[PDB]
Amino acid sequence: KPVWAPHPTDGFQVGNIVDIGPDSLTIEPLNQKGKTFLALINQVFPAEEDSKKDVEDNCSLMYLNEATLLHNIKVRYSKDRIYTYVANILIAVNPYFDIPKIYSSETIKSYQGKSLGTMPPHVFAIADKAFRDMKVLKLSQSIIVSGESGAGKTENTKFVLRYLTESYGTGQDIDDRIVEANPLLEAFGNAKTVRNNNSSRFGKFVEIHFNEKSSVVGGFVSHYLLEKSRICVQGKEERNYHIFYRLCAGASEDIRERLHLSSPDNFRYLNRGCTRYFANKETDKQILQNRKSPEYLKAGSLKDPLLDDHGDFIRMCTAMKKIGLDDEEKLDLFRVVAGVLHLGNIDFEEAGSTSGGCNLKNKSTQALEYCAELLGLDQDDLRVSLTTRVMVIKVPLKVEQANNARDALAKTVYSHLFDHVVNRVNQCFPFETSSYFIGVLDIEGFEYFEHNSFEQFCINYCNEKLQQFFNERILKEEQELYQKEGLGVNEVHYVDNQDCIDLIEARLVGILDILDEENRLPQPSDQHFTSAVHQKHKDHFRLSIPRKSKLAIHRNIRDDEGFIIRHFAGAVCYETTQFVEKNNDALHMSLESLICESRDKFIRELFELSFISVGNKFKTQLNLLLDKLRSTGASFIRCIKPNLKMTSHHFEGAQILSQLQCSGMVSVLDLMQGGFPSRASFHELYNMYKKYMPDKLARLDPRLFCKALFKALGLNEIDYKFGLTKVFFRPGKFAEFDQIMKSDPDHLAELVKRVNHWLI
Ligand SMILES: Nc1ncnc2c1ncn2[C@@H]1O[C@H](COP(=O)(O)OP(=O)(O)O)[C@@H](O)[C@H]1O
Numbered sequence: 001k002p003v004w005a006p007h008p009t010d011g012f013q014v015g016n017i018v019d020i021g022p023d024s025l026t027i028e029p030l031n032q033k034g035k036t037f038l039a040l041i042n043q044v045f046p047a048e049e050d051s052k053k054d055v056e057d058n059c060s061l062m063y064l065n066e067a068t069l070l071h072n073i074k075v076r077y078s079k080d081r082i083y084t085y086v087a088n089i090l091i092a093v094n095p096y097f098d099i100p101k102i103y104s105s106e107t108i109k110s111y112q113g114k115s116l117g118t119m120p121p122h123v124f125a126i127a128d129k130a131f132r133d134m135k136v137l138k139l140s141q142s143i144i145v146s147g148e149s150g151a152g153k154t155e156n157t158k159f160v161l162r163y164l165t166e167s168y169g170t171g172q173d174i175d176d177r178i179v180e181a182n183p184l185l186e187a188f189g190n191a192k193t194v195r196n197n198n199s200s201r202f203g204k205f206v207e208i209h210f211n212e213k214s215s216v217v218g219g220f221v222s223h224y225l226l227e228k229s230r231i232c233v234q235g236k237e238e239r240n241y242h243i244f245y246r247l248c249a250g251a252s253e254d255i256r257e258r259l260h261l262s263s264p265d266n267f268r269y270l271n272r273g274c275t276r277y278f279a280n281k282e283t284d285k286q287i288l289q290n291r292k293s294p295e296y297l298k299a300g301s302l303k304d305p306l307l308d309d310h311g312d313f314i315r316m317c318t319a320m321k322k323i324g325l326d327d328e329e330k331l332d333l334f335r336v337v338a339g340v341l342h343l344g345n346i347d348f349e350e351a352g353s354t355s356g357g358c359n360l361k362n363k364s365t366q367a368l369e370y371c372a373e374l375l376g377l378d379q380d381d382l383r384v385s386l387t388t389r390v391m392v393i394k395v396p397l398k399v400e401q402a403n404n405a406r407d408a409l410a411k412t413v414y415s416h417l418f419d420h421v422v423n424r425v426n427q428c429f430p431f432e433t434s435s436y437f438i439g440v441l442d443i444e445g446f447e448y449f450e451h452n453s454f455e456q457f458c459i460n461y462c463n464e465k466l467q468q469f470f471n472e473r474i475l476k477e478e479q480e481l482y483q484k485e486g487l488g489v490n491e492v493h494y495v496d497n498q499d500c501i502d503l504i505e506a507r508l509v510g511i512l513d514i515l516d517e518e519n520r521l522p523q524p525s526d527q528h529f530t531s532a533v534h535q536k537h538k539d540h541f542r543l544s545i546p547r548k549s550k551l552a553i554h555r556n557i558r559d560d561e562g563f564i565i566r567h568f569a570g571a572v573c574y575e576t577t578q579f580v581e582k583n584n585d586a587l588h589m590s591l592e593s594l595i596c597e598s599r600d601k602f603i604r605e606l607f608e609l610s611f612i613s614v615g616n617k618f619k620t621q622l623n624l625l626l627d628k629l630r631s632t633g634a635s636f637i638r639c640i641k642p643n644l645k646m647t648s649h650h651f652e653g654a655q656i657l658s659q660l661q662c663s664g665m666v667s668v669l670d671l672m673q674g675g676f677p678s679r680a681s682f683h684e685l686y687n688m689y690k691k692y693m694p695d696k697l698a699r700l701d702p703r704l705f706c707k708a709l710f711k712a713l714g715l716n717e718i719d720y721k722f723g724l725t726k727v728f729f730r731p732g733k734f735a736e737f738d739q740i741m742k743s744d745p746d747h748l749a750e751l752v753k754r755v756n757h758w759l760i
C-alpha cells in the first residue's frame with residue numbers, strides 16, 4: 001500500500017494513495033492524516049514493503065525504480081555504506097570524510113579472488129573483477145569512473161590503482177611508483193575550484209600493464225586538456241595549480257631565497273584568486289610568517305580533510321624521491337614554477353602620443369630580472385619580445401597586447417612543464433612489452449556555467465563522444481547479443497547523438513575545422529568564425545543563435561558572439577570570445593625563439609605563421625582513447641556527489657536523484673534487472689569438462705551436459721537462462737557462474753563426480 005511520490009528537496013517522500021483523478025493521484029503523506037497533495041500518475045512509484053532494510057545490489061529490490069533506488073542508497077549512506085551495485089555497475093556516494101579501515105591492506109587482501117557479491121560492494125571488487133576477466137578472457141580491461149565535479153572520481157581511481165598494484169604487483173619499489181605518481185600529477189594539474197578543493201584540471205587514462213603471468217610490469221599515463229586559463233587568473237574563491245601554494249607554504253628558506261618567493265598576494269598569477277593555504281592547527285605553525293598573505297592572517301586557513309599545502313609539499317618531495325627524481329630535477333621543476341610567477345609580475349604602461357605602444361613599468365624591473373635569471377633569458381630580449389611585434393619590421397604593442405604576450409608565454413611554459421612531468425612519471429615505471437592492461441579513465445563530465453568558453457566546449461565535446469560509447473556498450477551491444485541469442489529481453493532504446501558529434505568534429509564542415517580555418521586566415525576573428533559556423537549549419541537542429549535561448553543572460557549576445565549547442569545533457573550557450581586564441585597551442589615565433597634559446601638546458605629541453613590546433617589535437621587524442629575503450633572489456637563506477645557543501649552525512653535527495661537520472665542510471669534499471677551480465681557458450685563449457693567425463697556424460701550434446709551440470713549443482717531456472725548457443729546468468733549470480741567456469745583440474749573432477757552421482 002505505501003508508495004513513493006515527489007518531494008521538492010528529498011526527491012521522493014512516502015505516502016498512501018487516497019484518490020485518483022484525470023492525470024493525477026492524491027497522496028496522503030505518511031502519518032499526516034487529513035493532509036494531501038497531487039502528483040502525476042507516472043511520478044508515483046511502488047515502495048519496498050520493508051522501509052528499514054537495505055540491499056547490496058539494487059537488482060535485489062522487489063520493485064526497482066528511481067524512487068526505491070534512491071531510498072536504498074540513502075539508507076546505506078546513513079550507515080557509511082557508500083558502495084552499492086546495480087548488477088555489475090558500482091554506485092559510489094562521496095562520504096566527504098575518511099571511513100575507518102575500509103581501504104586498509106587487510107580489506108585489500110579480503111577482496112582478492114572473491115566473486116562479485118561474495119563480499120560487500122566495494123571499488124576493490126570492481127578492480128578484482130577487471131583483473132580476473134583480464135586473466136581468464138586474455139582481454140585488456142577499462143574501468144570508467146564517472147560523475148560530477150567533486151563526486152569522487154579521482155579518489156576512486158586511486159583506490160583502484162592501489163588495490164591492483166598492492167594485490168598483483170611483486171612487492172618491490174616499482175609497485176609503489178604507480179601509486180606515488182599521484183602527488184606529483186595532482187600538484188601540477190589539480191587546483192581549488194568552487195565545486196572541489198582538489199579539482200582535476202586535466203583528464204587522464206592510467207594503464208597498469210601486465211605480463212603473461214598477470215603480474216604488474218609497468219604503467220602508462222595519458223593526459224588531456226590541461227586548463228591553461230587558470231595559470232594566469234582565477235576567481236576570488238579559486239586558486240591556481242596546487243604546486244604554487246605547496247611551494248610558497250613548504251619550501252625551505254634556502255629555496256625561497258633562490259627563487260625569490262614570498263606570500264601568494266605578491267604575485268599577479270595568484271592574487272586575483274584565494275591566497276590562503278589549506279592548513280590545520282598543527283601545520284599552520286609549520287608555515288613560516290613570511291609565507292602568509294594578509295588575507296590568511298585575517299581570515300585564517302582553508303579547511304579540508306585531505307588537502308594541506310605544507311603537508312602536501314613534504315609528501316610531494318617524498319614521492320619525487322621514491323619514483324627516482326634526483327634533487328637537481330626537483331629544483332629544475334621549482335625554478336620553472338617561480339619563473340612563471342615572476343613573469344606574471346611584469347607590468348606595462350602606455351607609450352606614444354596616441355597610446356599606440358607600451359613600456360615596462362619601472363616598478364616591474366625586479367620581476368623582469370628574477371624571471372630572466374630563473375628562465376635563463378637575457379633581460380633585454382625578454383623586454384623586447386613582450387613589448388614589440390616582428391612582421392623585417394619591429395612594431396610597438398599596445399598594453400593589452402603586451403599583457404597577452406606575457407600570458408601566452410606563461411601558459412606555454414607551464415603547459416610544457418606539465419607535459420614534462422607526465423612524461424617523467426611514465427619514465428619511472430616503463431615496460432618494453434606487455435600482454436594486457438587495466439586502464440582507469442578519470443575525466444570531468446558535462447559542465448555549464450553562466451559563461452561558457454572553449455574549455456567547456458572541449459570537455460562537453462568529449463562527453464558527447466563518451467556518452468555514445470556508454471550507449472553502444474551498455475545498451476546497443478548488450479541487447480544485440482540478447483536478441484541474437486533469442487532471450488526475449490524487453491528493449492531499452494536511446495537516441496543516438498552522431499548529429500551533435502558530426503556538428504563539432506566532421507572534416508571541413510565541423511566546428512573544429514571551421515575554427516582552424518579562422519586561425520589560418522590573415523587577420524583571425526572570433527566574430528568571423530561564429531558567423532561561418534551559423535552560415536554552414538543554418539539547417540542544423542543542434543545549433544542556434546544565442547538570441548534563441550530560454551534565459552535573459554544570453555538575450556544581449558549577438559549572432560557572431562556565440563552559439564548554442566543543444567547537447568542531450570542540456571542546451572549550452574557558448575560565448576565565442578577568445579576561441580581563436582584558445583584554439584592555438586603554438587607561441588608566436590619571437591616568444592618561441594626566445595624560450596628555445598635559453599641558457600638553461602632544462603628550459604631548452606621543455607621545447608626540444610605559427611599555429612597548432614588545440615581542438616584537433618584533442619580530437620586525435622580522444623579517438624586513440626576511444627579505440628582502446630572499444631577494444632577492451634568495460635567496468636563502470638558512477639560517483640555521486642551528496643551535496644554542494646562538501647559535508648558528511650548530508651544526503652540531498654533531489655540533487656542525488658537528478659544525478660541518477662542525468663547519468664542514464666535510471667533509464668537502464670529494467671535492462672540491468674532483467675539482463676544477464678554473465679555468459680559462456682555450451683561448447684566451451686562442454687570442452688573444458690570433456691576430458692573428465694565418463695562415456696555417459698560425453699555422449700550428451702553440449703547443451704544437455706550443461707543442463708545436467710546445473711541440475712546436479714541445485715541451480716534453478718531463476719538463476720540462469722539458456723540462449724541459442726550460450727548459457728546466461730542473472731545479476732547476483734556471479735558466485736554460481738564463477739564456480740561453473742573454474743578450470744582447476746581438482747575442481748572440474750569434483751563437479752563431474754557430483755553430476756555422476758546425481759544421474760544414478
Ligand atoms: N571515498 C572517499 N573517502 C574519503 N574522502 C573522499 C572519498 N571520495 C571523495 N572524497 C573527498 O571528496 C573530495 C572530492 O573527491 P574527488 O575524487 O577529487 O572528486 P572528482 O575527481 O570527482 O572531482 C576529495 O578530495 C575527498 O576530500
Ligand SMILES: [Mg+2]
Nearest residue numbers: 153154199200
Ligand atoms: Mg578529479
